Amino acid sequence: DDVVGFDDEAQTVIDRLGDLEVIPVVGMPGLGKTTLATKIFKHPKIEYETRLWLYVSQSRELYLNIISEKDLALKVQYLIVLDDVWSTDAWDRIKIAFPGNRVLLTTRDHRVARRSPHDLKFLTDEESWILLEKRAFHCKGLPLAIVVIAGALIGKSKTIKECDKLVRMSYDVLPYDWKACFLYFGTFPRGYLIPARKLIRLWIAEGFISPECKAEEYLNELVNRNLVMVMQRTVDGQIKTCRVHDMLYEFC
Ligand SMILES: Nc1ncnc2c1ncn2[C@@H]1O[C@H](COP(=O)(O)OP(=O)(O)O)[C@@H](O)[C@H]1O
């Protein structure tokens, strides 16, 4: 629950939630579409809608994850979130899954206009100050830009720094041992969900070096530097599934 400025923005999409609606959330990458959907998915809706997350991307086999296309269209038979849809043809074939039920949609494409698209707002100058203050201590409205800005120097003046170059600005302050592990996310598909334990054994074999213990600390710091997003946690090993943002992936 570390989200700012989306209290009034989520309610607007909640009032949107007459048998099956689309509800598309349009916005440039890094604006907070996945973050807003998480706030909406976990908003007090126990008495309203069940509730499962289905992450797709630019990549039919995701039907079975809770419990041959004919078998994939019969046993699928509420509110379910679609994380990232890239084209109209991707939704025009997956929609025949399970027809007061709704489906939440977030995407970066305005061409996916299916029924008025709710364009996500930008953080104001005051709400951006709150996000930067809490993400550094604990610029133009883009939350990803505010997130990438990692305070490596805590001096009396930080005016020396007043989206690729912002990633480079946090990339230049990374130690040499962390650069090879951060760029290794380019060897995986765009938006790939990498298991943390598997990624650690891959870093050891690649020569990025007890070794499995400090490799987690390399992953913890990259998350602390706000460069790697943790998707799933647990109680046996904490960080379970992680991924890198699509804008940070273009840099890798
Ligand atoms: N309202 C917000 N408050 C705090 N952090 C945010 C907010 N919106 C986005 N972020 C941060 O930006 C990063 C990437 O945003 P993301 O949800 O991927 O946007 P999109 O879904 O539009 O690509 C996330 O790690 C998240 O922490």
Numbering used by the authors: 155 to 171, 176 to 207, 210 to 219, 223 to 230, 244 to 253, 262 to 283, 288 to 302, 306 to 329, ...
Quote what the paper states about this structure.
Isomorphous native crystals of the NRC1 NB-ARC domain were generated, and X-ray data collected to 2.5 Å resolution. Iterative manual rebuilding and refinement resulted in a final structure consisting of 252 of a total 346 residues present in the expressed protein construct. Several regions of the protein could not be modelled due to discontinuous electron density, including much of the ARC1 subdomain, and the solvent-exposed ɑ-helices of the NB domain. Submission of this model to the DALI server returns APAF-1 as the major structural homologue, despite sharing little (24%) sequence identity. The electron density within the nucleotide-binding pocket of the NRC1 NB-ARC domain, and the surrounding regions, was well resolved and allowed us to unambiguously position a molecule of ADP, and the side-chains of interacting residues. Using PDBe PISA, we defined a network of side-chain and main-chain interactions between the bound ADP and the protein.
The majority of these plant intracellular receptors belong to the nucleotide-binding leucine-rich repeat (NLR) protein family, similar to those involved in certain animal cell-death or innate immune responses. Plant NLRs share a common architecture with animal NLRs, containing nucleotide binding (NB) and Leucine-rich repeat (LRR) domains, but can be further classified into CNLs and TNLs, dependent on whether they have an N-terminal coiled-coil (CC) domain or N-terminal toll/interleukin-1 receptor (TIR) domain. The N-terminal CC or TIR domains are typically described as required for downstream signalling following perception of pathogens, the LRR is implicated in auto-inhibition and/or effector detection, and the central NB-ARC domain is posited as a regulatory domain, acting as a “switch” that determines whether the protein is in an active or inactive state. Here we characterise the NB-ARC domain from the tomato NLR NRC1, which we have expressed and purified from both bacterial (E. coli) and insect (Sf9) cell culture.
